Design a protein around this ligand. Sequence first.
Ligand SMILES: [Mg+2]
Ligand SMILES: [Mg+2]
Ligand SMILES: [Mg+2]
Lengths: 104, 521, 104
Amino acid sequence: PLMGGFGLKHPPPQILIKNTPVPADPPTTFNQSKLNSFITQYSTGQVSVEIEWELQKENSKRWNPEIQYTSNYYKSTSVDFAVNTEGVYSEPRPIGTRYLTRNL
Amino acid sequence: GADGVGNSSGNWHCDSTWMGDRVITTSTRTWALPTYNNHLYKQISNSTSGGSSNDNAYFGYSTPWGYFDFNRFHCHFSPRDWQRLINNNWGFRPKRLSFKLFNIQVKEVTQNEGTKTIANNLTSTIQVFTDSEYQLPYVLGSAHQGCLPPFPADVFMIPQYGYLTLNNGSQAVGRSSFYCLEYFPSQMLRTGNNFQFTYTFEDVPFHSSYAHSQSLDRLMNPLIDQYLYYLSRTQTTGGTTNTQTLGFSQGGPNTMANQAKNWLPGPCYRQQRVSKTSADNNNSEYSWTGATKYHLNGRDSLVNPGPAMASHKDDEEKFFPQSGVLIFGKQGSEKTNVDIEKVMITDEEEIRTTNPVATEQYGSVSTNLQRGNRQAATADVNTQGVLPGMVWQDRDVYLQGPIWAKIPHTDGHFHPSPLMGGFGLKHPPPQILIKNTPVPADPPTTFNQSKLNSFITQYSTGQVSVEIEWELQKENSKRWNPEIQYTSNYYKSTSVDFAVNTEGVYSEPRPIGTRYLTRNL
Amino acid sequence: YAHSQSLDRLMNPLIDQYLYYLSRTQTTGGTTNTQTLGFSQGGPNTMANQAKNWLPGPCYRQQRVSKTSADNNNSEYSWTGATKYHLNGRDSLVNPGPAMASHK
Ligand SMILES: [Mg+2]
Ligand SMILES: [Mg+2]
Ligand SMILES: [Mg+2]
């Protein structure tokens, strides 16, 4: 896929969810029209997702040190990839995957 | 099944499964059931609803029960599944049914100071039973509203059960019967409970989901003469003084109308012809006076749709028999005196190969004995009962039409194919009756013998699933050329047919019959 | 046994049909009445117009005779007004004939 990632013919399927309609009180005389009065509802719960990933370990025979992703050592008002004083979490930068090197 | 308040008693099952010679349809819907008649049984008649004519007089009872109706093909077949059925099969019939009620919720309604409060009444019951021994008047089979909706996302209300017995005007007679539905065993369900029922259909003929590619009057070899003769001449030709003679000829390729044949077209009960273009019709009120009727115990009923007859002859598509075809309403069409553009008039032209045209005579018969001073006289036959050697096709079924009817419990019942179309069953899917059990409000603290008339306001809701297994007769067309098939139209549209619009309303834009494929006669 | 229902009264008396019938052929109101086509759904007050599945049994019409002699015609019609079949040049009375109800 051009945005990056894994192209799958048979990807993780779409998981669809809805609240079942609960009709409000119907009239006491029959009417053929579909019901349009429902009790106002929402749902909440927890969701868990577990993914197993396979790794290809680095086997660098290079003599000199490599580039590594590192947090910056210096003093900051906030720590990167944490919450601020108001409880808002932020991701301050994009992090790619190409730090290690290999020959062609 | 039996479980707790926080556990679901069933899952959503909507889909069709196509196998070798079988299709299993499954639809699930959400319903709502009010308390009907404030828990009472009531005597009703034409004098209780108003009263006008003896033709419309009745006597019966309204009950506090509701019932389930899924006696329409669209309760089971999606339009796509209907297309798959009709384009590929020469016949089908129902085999078995499974019915389930689950995820029952009983709700209490409190009306104080204009405030609308709806709460769960976890300890209240509904009552459900099946009339498996056909001990109650059977009202399924009378093309009533209240069916499972065609669109799975639509929520519906269950219709109220009522029935008729014998009347003399607005009055009862000694033979009139009263039925109490609480005089039956019924299952009682709370919110954790579910209901299930299974049924097997009796052996019924396959519906003929094809049209004939031959007509009854054109079964001969068009290259060969007959060995049989017909009377072709009764008077001498040529000269000045024409005299009596008897000349005989053999029917052949250019005299197919005179050929000896083995069979006769199906029976007739003539209907008036109405044009879909108002200007071509007579300027009078003939909806009743010009109507084809039956007369039973002093009252007239319309013959509607009546015997299966063809709607019109070749190049006469604008004409229909007055009450000889099924007429469906377009989405949202009203009950009374709606315009032609609000209805969908079915067309049974495909059966004109064996069945007479509804609006024409069956034929002509001799009415006298011709001689020297008396000329041969004939008359039109406008009613023709069955004759040996007659053949016919029954009325087609439609996606939005009925499936079955109960064959009346009678001594005689000739070719008991229900006239609205479908399957005639002596022992049809039983009536499934449902009601909310009355829950009395606080009684007085001093005994009083009077029946209680103060109840807590309740309704119920839940899901219903219906599964039908159908048997198919696959098309085995040895024809060389392509056949007719039902197809959606290829061109650009504001909306797609058999879908929802911008407001979420589902509509069925046309009737869809079953006779696309063809076969020889 | 006798039937406690009639063939023309098998419907549910509380519910309308989904099917329509031709209820109007001429405009109502005004001075100049013209051709129209109006359709209605049969219901509790129009049972006579409802779509039905069945038909009453066969008929071979008989003359009506009153048990009170004064209500009948002053002629000899025991034979001339009789319902008959014709077989090989002779007439036979249809007696009692097809099962039909005696009176309304
Ligand atoms: Mg329906
Ligand atoms: Mg046509
Ligand atoms: Mg019976």
